[PDB]
Every structure is written in C-alpha cells, then in structure tokens.
Amino acid sequence: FYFMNQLTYGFLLMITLLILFSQFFLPMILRLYVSRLFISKL
Amino acid sequence: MLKRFPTPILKVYWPFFVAGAAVYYGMSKAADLSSNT
Amino acid sequence: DESILLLTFLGFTGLVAKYLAPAYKDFADARMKKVSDVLNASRNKHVEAVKD
Amino acid sequence: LQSTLDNIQSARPFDELTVDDLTKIKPEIDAKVEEMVKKGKWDVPGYKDRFGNLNVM
Amino acid sequence: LTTFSLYTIIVLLVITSLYTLTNNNNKIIGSRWLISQEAIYDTIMNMTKGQIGGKNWGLYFPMIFTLFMFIFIANLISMIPYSFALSAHLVFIISLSIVI
Amino acid sequence: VSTLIPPKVVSSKNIGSAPNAKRIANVVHFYKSLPQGPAPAIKANTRLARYKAKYFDGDNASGKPLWHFALGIIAFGYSMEYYFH
Known part of the structure; x- marks a missing residue:
C-alpha cells in the first residue's frame, strides 16, 4: 500500500540527515575537540 | 545557530545516492508489478 | 489493555529516577x-x- | 610581560568561555577544524591522553 | 497525510532537540546533555578507527555515524506504549540494507 | 685577541627559542578573553528559549523535560488513540 510513501519520505529524510549531520553535528563537536586541545597544548 | 561547513557529501557519497535512486526505480517496477496483490 | 504497558512504563521510569539518574x-x-x-x-x- | 601577567590575573573565564570566542581569538582553530573535516583525519591525535574519550568502550 | 512521515518529522524535531537546546551558548565545558553525545561520537570514532582501519577511514565516519543514529532515535519513540511501530516496517529497513 | 662580546646579542636571539613561541601564543591568548564572566547573555527569549534556560543548562541538567516530552507523547499518541481506536 504505502510502499512509495514510506520509501520516498524515508529516502528524503535519509539524505537529509546525511547532509545535515555531516555539515553540522560532527564538526560542531570537532570544534570542541580542537579548542580543548589547542588550549591544553597552548 | 550552527556554523555550516562544506563537508564532502557530493564528491564522496555519490554511489549510495545512486543506489537510492536505483532502489526507487526498482520500487517503481515492484509497485507497478506486485502492488496489485 | 494498553494502559497496563503504560503502568509498567511509569514504574520503570520511577525505578530509573531511583537508580540511573x-x-x-x-x-x-x-x-x-x-x-x-x-x-x-x-x-x-x-x-x-x-x-x- | 608584567602586563601579560596582569592580563592573565583578571581575565580567565575558565568556566564560561565560548568556543566562538576561541574561533574569534584564533581563526587558526576554524582553519584546522575545516581542514580536519575536508582531509578526513577524523582522529584527533594527542587529545585522548589528557582529555579521555569517556565513551562506553 | 501519513502518521509514519509525521513520525519522521518528530524524529527530525528530536534531532533539533539534541544539540541546539543542549549547547548553552557554545561553551567549552561540555554540559551534561553534551556529555552523552560526546560519548556517542567517541564510541563510534574509536570503533570505526579500528574497524576499517584505513588511511581513509574517517571519510565514511559521518555515514557510519548517521546510519546509526536513525536506528538509535526511532527505537526511542516506539518505546512509548501509546505509539505506532517506527522501524518495524521491514520493507523500509530491508530496503535501507539493499541501498547500503 | 680582543674583548669578545656575547652579553648583548639578545635583540635578535629572541625569535628562535621555545618560550618565544609560547609567549607569542599566550599574549595573543590573553587579551580577548572576557574578564569576569562578562557578556554571558543570561536573559534570552525566543518563545522556546526560557524552556532551555530553565531546564537544559548545566545547572539543572535533568532529563525530566524528556519525561514531559514523554508525557507529551502521552499527550499525543493517546490522543491519537482518541483519533484512531
């Protein structure tokens, strides 16, 4: 029945979270990594 | 909000996107061949 | 029929607030x-x- | 360097400093973050020693 | 409208509700809501650093991140008794495995 | 053969050594640091920001709003029960 429905909105939100977490949520914590490392190393 | 970074998702993650489009085309074949059950 | 699983959920979250928090x-x-x-x-x- | 010591004396927000203030005081932070993403060395070497990974495993 | 796509919208709202309200004004100190995400990032980082072990190991590290978190969040909403099954649509999850 | 002179060669020495690099790092590190917790922006409202400032800071940091969020799903899905079954 809703094979197209679930599949298409799942594809959209999968590629959405791909680009979203990639561009946003991994480097927003990698900034914390590099910041704490650069303060500790001076 | 959040600092947007150009993180590589087009020049790296192409074949999974290609596979997603191909599975959408396979679902076109399936829902035009086996959705009348 | 479905509120009994809710009762298990409330008791479990009470145990969570007792133990895990x-x-x-x-x-x-x-x-x-x-x-x-x-x-x-x-x-x-x-x-x-x-x-x- | 006496003024540097007086600057360290009354300007240490060691519990309330912003990492955006760190990018503002050092754009080298932003450059290393962006290059670390773009090359793909997602390891942060020399971090785990004094700043432990505190994960499950 | 479908309740399933609405559940995916609720998932994306929780995704907003894991980092924006978490991060008090971009602080170094790493508050309690951020400690869990730190632990997740480290236990995926040190995992796939040793798993694929490549020189180019981090290049799929976001992907191996984001393929996890969907299953991590969608099995935190169906845990509610008064809920509908999110990831128990086997056509969807098996099709995801086919795509991967 | 004469009065040799290394007491005063400090003027062009002070680049290559290791505390010079640390010194030019941390004199830059000290000026833009805010003095005594200034500009923390302790008051903010965006129709959802007082929820964050009251609940999701490091002071309280309790997961009970997730409880309320779970209660919200008890507000939602049970009402969806009233919409479905």
Whole structure:
C-alpha cells in the first residue's frame, strides 16, 4: 500500500540527515575537540 | 545557530545516492508489478 | 489493555529516577570536574611559565 | 610581560568561555577544524591522553 | 497525510532537540546533555578507527555515524506504549540494507 | 685577541627559542578573553528559549523535560488513540 510513501519520505529524510549531520553535528563537536586541545597544548 | 561547513557529501557519497535512486526505480517496477496483490 | 504497558512504563521510569539518574549525575559531575580541573591547571601552569 | 601577567590575573573565564570566542581569538582553530573535516583525519591525535574519550568502550 | 512521515518529522524535531537546546551558548565545558553525545561520537570514532582501519577511514565516519543514529532515535519513540511501530516496517529497513 | 662580546646579542636571539613561541601564543591568548564572566547573555527569549534556560543548562541538567516530552507523547499518541481506536 504505502510502499512509495514510506520509501520516498524515508529516502528524503535519509539524505537529509546525511547532509545535515555531516555539515553540522560532527564538526560542531570537532570544534570542541580542537579548542580543548589547542588550549591544553597552548 | 550552527556554523555550516562544506563537508564532502557530493564528491564522496555519490554511489549510495545512486543506489537510492536505483532502489526507487526498482520500487517503481515492484509497485507497478506486485502492488496489485 | 494498553494502559497496563503504560503502568509498567511509569514504574520503570520511577525505578530509573531511583537508580540511573544519580549514577549518570555522578558520572557527569566527575567528568565535569575533571575537564575543568585540567583546563584550569594547564592555564595556571603556563601562567607560571610566563612568570619564569 | 608584567602586563601579560596582569592580563592573565583578571581575565580567565575558565568556566564560561565560548568556543566562538576561541574561533574569534584564533581563526587558526576554524582553519584546522575545516581542514580536519575536508582531509578526513577524523582522529584527533594527542587529545585522548589528557582529555579521555569517556565513551562506553 | 501519513502518521509514519509525521513520525519522521518528530524524529527530525528530536534531532533539533539534541544539540541546539543542549549547547548553552557554545561553551567549552561540555554540559551534561553534551556529555552523552560526546560519548556517542567517541564510541563510534574509536570503533570505526579500528574497524576499517584505513588511511581513509574517517571519510565514511559521518555515514557510519548517521546510519546509526536513525536506528538509535526511532527505537526511542516506539518505546512509548501509546505509539505506532517506527522501524518495524521491514520493507523500509530491508530496503535501507539493499541501498547500503 | 680582543674583548669578545656575547652579553648583548639578545635583540635578535629572541625569535628562535621555545618560550618565544609560547609567549607569542599566550599574549595573543590573553587579551580577548572576557574578564569576569562578562557578556554571558543570561536573559534570552525566543518563545522556546526560557524552556532551555530553565531546564537544559548545566545547572539543572535533568532529563525530566524528556519525561514531559514523554508525557507529551502521552499527550499525543493517546490522543491519537482518541483519533484512531
């Protein structure tokens, strides 16, 4: 029945979270990594 | 909000996107061949 | 029929507030004090290096 | 360097400093973050020693 | 409208509700809501650093991140008794495995 | 053969050594640091920001709003029960 429905909105939100977490949520914590490392190393 | 970074998702993650489009085309074949059950 | 699983959920979250919440509280407090202590100590150390 | 010592004396927000203030005081932070993403060395070497990974495993 | 796509919208709202309200004004200190995400990032980081072990190991590290988190969040909403099954649509999850 | 002179060669020495690099790092590190917790922006409202400032800071940091969020799903899905079954 809703094979197209679930599949298409799942594809959209999968590629959405791909680009979203990639561009946003991994480097927003990698900034914390590099910041704490650069303060500790001076 | 959040600092947007150009993180590589087009020049790296192409074949999974290609596979997603191909599975959408396979679902076109399936829902035009086996959705009348 | 479905509110009984809700009752198990409420009792389980009560046990979570009894058991899991102070443990994660203490883990977060310990890591917080550790990172704050190291971050203060490195700064005080190279302040003393400036004095040297 | 006496003024540097007085600057370290009353300007240490070691519990309330912003990492955006760190990018503002050092754009080298932003450069290393963006290059670390773009090359793909997602390891942060020399971090785990004094700043432990505090994960499950 | 479908309740399933609405559940995916609720998932994306929780995704907003894991980092924006978490991060008090971009602080170094790493508050309690951020410690869990730190632990997740480290236990995926040190995992796939040793798993694929490549020189180019981090290049799929976001992907191995984001393929996890969907299953991590969608099995935190169906945990509610008064809920509908999110990831128990086997056509969807098996099709995801086919795509991967 | 004469009065040799290394007491005063400090003027062009002070680049290459290791405390010079640390010194030029941390004199830059100290000026833009805010003095005594200034500009923390302790008051903010965006129709959802007081929820964050009251609940999701490091002071309280309790997961009970998730409880309320779970209660919100008890507000939602049970009402969806009233919409479905």
